Scaffold this active site. Structure first.
Site, PDB file in Angstrom:
ATOM      1  N   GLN A  19     -79.927  -0.470 -14.586  1.00 18.65           N
ATOM      2  CA  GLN A  19     -80.530   0.593 -15.333  1.00 18.65           C
ATOM      3  C   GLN A  19     -79.564   1.789 -15.497  1.00 18.65           C
ATOM      4  O   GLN A  19     -79.808   2.660 -16.336  1.00 18.65           O
ATOM      5  CB  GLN A  19     -81.844   1.069 -14.680  1.00 18.65           C
ATOM      6  CG  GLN A  19     -81.690   1.752 -13.329  1.00 18.65           C
ATOM      7  CD  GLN A  19     -83.037   2.084 -12.735  1.00 18.65           C
ATOM      8  OE1 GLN A  19     -83.661   1.244 -12.113  1.00 18.65           O
ATOM      9  NE2 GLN A  19     -83.519   3.312 -12.988  1.00 18.65           N
ATOM     10  N   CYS A  25     -86.600   2.588 -14.652  1.00 21.01           N
ATOM     11  CA  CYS A  25     -87.049   1.479 -13.795  1.00 21.01           C
ATOM     12  C   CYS A  25     -88.342   0.844 -14.319  1.00 21.01           C
ATOM     13  O   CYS A  25     -88.543  -0.361 -14.201  1.00 21.01           O
ATOM     14  CB  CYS A  25     -87.232   1.928 -12.355  1.00 21.01           C
ATOM     15  SG  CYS A  25     -88.523   3.209 -12.132  1.00 21.01           S
ATOM     16  N   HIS A 162     -90.718   4.174  -7.936  1.00 19.40           N
ATOM     17  CA  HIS A 162     -89.818   3.164  -8.459  1.00 19.40           C
ATOM     18  C   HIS A 162     -90.653   1.936  -8.874  1.00 19.40           C
ATOM     19  O   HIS A 162     -91.751   1.690  -8.335  1.00 19.40           O
ATOM     20  CB  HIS A 162     -88.771   2.817  -7.406  1.00 19.40           C
ATOM     21  CG  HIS A 162     -87.691   1.906  -7.861  1.00 19.40           C
ATOM     22  ND1 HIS A 162     -87.095   2.033  -9.105  1.00 19.40           N
ATOM     23  CD2 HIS A 162     -87.006   0.937  -7.231  1.00 19.40           C
ATOM     24  CE1 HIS A 162     -86.165   1.099  -9.244  1.00 19.40           C
ATOM     25  NE2 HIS A 162     -86.074   0.429  -8.100  1.00 19.40           N
ATOM     26  N   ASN A 182     -84.488  -6.039  -7.952  1.00 19.56           N
ATOM     27  CA  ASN A 182     -84.230  -4.663  -8.365  1.00 19.56           C
ATOM     28  C   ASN A 182     -83.384  -4.633  -9.627  1.00 19.56           C
ATOM     29  O   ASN A 182     -82.961  -5.693 -10.138  1.00 19.56           O
ATOM     30  CB  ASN A 182     -83.634  -3.871  -7.166  1.00 19.56           C
ATOM     31  CG  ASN A 182     -83.885  -2.385  -7.158  1.00 19.56           C
ATOM     32  OD1 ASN A 182     -84.382  -1.837  -8.137  1.00 19.56           O
ATOM     33  ND2 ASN A 182     -83.572  -1.711  -6.033  1.00 19.56           N
TER      34      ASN A 182
HETATM   35  C1  LIG Z   1     -87.602   4.488 -11.192  1.00 20.16           C
HETATM   36  C2  LIG Z   1     -87.130   5.389 -12.250  1.00 20.16           C
HETATM   37  O1  LIG Z   1     -86.088   5.099 -12.858  1.00 20.16           O
HETATM   38  C3  LIG Z   1     -87.968   6.603 -12.649  1.00 20.16           C
HETATM   39  C4  LIG Z   1     -87.704   7.801 -11.794  1.00 20.16           C
HETATM   40  C5  LIG Z   1     -88.275   9.056 -12.501  1.00 20.16           C
HETATM   41  C6  LIG Z   1     -87.538   9.426 -13.789  1.00 20.16           C
HETATM   42  C7  LIG Z   1     -86.288  10.302 -13.573  1.00 20.16           C
HETATM   43  N1  LIG Z   1     -89.416   6.287 -12.730  1.00 20.16           N
HETATM   44  C8  LIG Z   1     -90.368   6.421 -11.778  1.00 20.16           C
HETATM   45  C9  LIG Z   1     -91.479   6.064 -12.428  1.00 20.16           C
HETATM   46  C10 LIG Z   1     -92.954   5.920 -11.977  1.00 20.16           C
HETATM   47  C11 LIG Z   1     -93.182   6.490 -10.540  1.00 20.16           C
HETATM   48  N2  LIG Z   1     -93.786   6.687 -12.949  1.00 20.16           N
HETATM   49  C12 LIG Z   1     -93.496   8.201 -13.069  1.00 20.16           C
HETATM   50  C13 LIG Z   1     -93.814   8.635 -14.526  1.00 20.16           C
HETATM   51  C14 LIG Z   1     -92.846   9.333 -15.270  1.00 20.16           C
HETATM   52  C15 LIG Z   1     -93.089   9.630 -16.607  1.00 20.16           C
HETATM   53  C16 LIG Z   1     -94.305   9.261 -17.207  1.00 20.16           C
HETATM   54  N3  LIG Z   1     -94.481   9.501 -18.540  1.00 20.16           N
HETATM   55  C17 LIG Z   1     -95.608   9.158 -19.140  1.00 20.16           C
HETATM   56  C18 LIG Z   1     -96.599   8.569 -18.436  1.00 20.16           C
HETATM   57  C19 LIG Z   1     -96.498   8.282 -17.105  1.00 20.16           C
HETATM   58  C20 LIG Z   1     -95.301   8.572 -16.455  1.00 20.16           C
HETATM   59  C21 LIG Z   1     -95.032   8.290 -15.101  1.00 20.16           C
HETATM   60  C22 LIG Z   1     -93.388   4.419 -12.068  1.00 20.16           C
HETATM   61  C23 LIG Z   1     -92.412   3.483 -11.281  1.00 20.16           C
HETATM   62  C24 LIG Z   1     -94.809   4.130 -11.680  1.00 20.16           C
HETATM   63  N4  LIG Z   1     -91.141   5.732 -13.718  1.00 20.16           N
HETATM   64  N5  LIG Z   1     -89.884   5.913 -13.868  1.00 20.16           N
END
Ligand SMILES: *CC(=O)[C@H](CCCC)n1cc([C@@](C)(NCc2ccc3ncccc3c2)C(C)C)nn1
Length: 215
Positions: A19, A25, A162, A182
């Site tokens: 990624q 992720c 994550h 991963n």
């Molecule tokens: C794992 C990764 O690359 C990112 C880390 C944050 C981004 C810098 N990641 C974590 C998530 C989780 C925890 N969801 C968070 C989230 C972020 C934005 C968002 N936008 C719209 C709706 C809902 C959201 C949730 C996920 C693994 C459950 N996502 N990316």
């Protein structure tokens, strides 16, 4: 359920991806799950495009994060079920910047019809995985940076941060474990995989499990 399952034994899982510095992720977790589900419905194993989600799923937040369940919903409700090939829409967010969406000239690699959100119970997730294949999961990976190998018993299990892919488990091992793909290259962990102890909600692994449905 079987004492052990590893979907890699069937050739059901694509190679480990990277990624990069993008918070994508969620997209790797969702696409890895679609890739495996597509193969298991009786079709050939095909690499599919995270970049389609990162750039074009406007119900998620690109390199700022998202939800696997939103991704599955976007595919069905906004993209007519279609998932483009990696081959036709390569990853371009490794620097942390998601480029604007390109709608044209990609090629369809898979289709899905919906998704399921699984019970918050490791035995129940395992039983589903044993028959239906790999499962997208959220975890607390805050303690994972220094993991090199073995079955993790010490996972910091406090906040989901994550998205990864469950590909198997082994209940007969000295320390029963999950097998997790991963998206941090094959240089990390066990050629890109981690094993965590199974049965004690390590890394909050039971909390947000889901899968695409392929007809
Ligand atoms: C794992 C990764 O690359 C990112 C880390 C944050 C981004 C810098 N990641 C974590 C998530 C989780 C925890 N969801 C968070 C989230 C972020 C934005 C968002 N936008 C719209 C709706 C809902 C959201 C949730 C996920 C693994 C459950 N996502 N990316």
């Amino acid at each position: 359920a079987p004492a052990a399952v590893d979907w890699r034994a069937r050739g059901a899982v694509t190679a480990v991806k990277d990624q990069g510095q993008c918070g994508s992720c969620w997209a790797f977790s969702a696409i890895g799950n679609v890739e495996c589900q597509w193969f298991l419905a009786g079709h050939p194993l095909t690499n599919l495009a995270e970049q389609m989600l990162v750039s074009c799923d406007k119900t998620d937040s690109g390199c700022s994060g998202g939800l696997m369940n939103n991704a599955f919903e976007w595919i069905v409700q906004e993209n007519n079920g279609a998932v483009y090939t990696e081959d036709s829409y390569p990853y371009a967010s490794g620097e942390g910047i998601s480029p604007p969406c390109t709608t044209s000239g990609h090629t369809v690699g898979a289709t899905i019809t919906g998704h399921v959100e699984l019970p918050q119970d490791e035995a129940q997730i395992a039983a589903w995985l044993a028959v239906n294949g790999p499962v997208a999961v959220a975890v607390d990976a805050s303690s994972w940076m220094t993991y090199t190998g073995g079955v993790m018993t010490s996972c910091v299990s406090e906040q989901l941060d994550h998205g990864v892919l469950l590909v198997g488990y082994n209940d007969g091992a000295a320390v029963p474990y999950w097998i997790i793909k991963n998206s941090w290259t094959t240089q990390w962990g066990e050629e890109g995989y981690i094993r965590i102890a199974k049965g004690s909600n390590q890394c909050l692994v039971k909390e947000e499990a889901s899968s695409a449905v392929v007809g």
